[PDB]
C-alpha cells in the first residue's frame, strides 16, 4: 500500500508549463531512479538536452 | 569476490578513443545502472550529448 504519490507524471508536467530545453537534474541515488529514468526517456520524445 | 572485471572504466575510455560527442545510450535496466551513472557523471566531465 504505496501511500507516496506517483511524482514521476507531476515533475514531468512543471517542465512542459515552463516550456524548458536545456536543464540540469541533480539527483542522489538515495529514493531511486524511478524520476530519473522518466525524464531520460522522455528526453527523447520531446527533446530535452538535460 | 567479484569474478567480473569493472567494465565502468573501459567503456569511458573507448568512447574516448572514438572521440564520440552525441551518441545514444540504449541501456536496460536488467544489469544495473552502474555504467549508467558513469556516463551521466563523465557527461558533464567532458560535455556529451547523450
Known amino acids: 500500500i504505496q501511500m507516496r504519490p506517483d511524482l514521476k507524471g507531476a515533475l514531468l508536467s512543471l517542465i512542459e508549463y515552463y ?5 540540469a537534474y541533480l539527483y542522489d541515488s538515495d529514493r531511486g531512479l524511478s524520476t530519473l529514468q522518466a525524464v531520460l526517456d ?3 520524445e520531446k527533446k530535452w538536452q538535460v
Chains 1, 2 share one sequence.
Request: no cysteine; aromatic share 24%; charged share 25%.
Open 42 to 44: 522522455s528526453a527523447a
Open 19 to 23: 516550456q524548458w530545453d536545456k536543464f
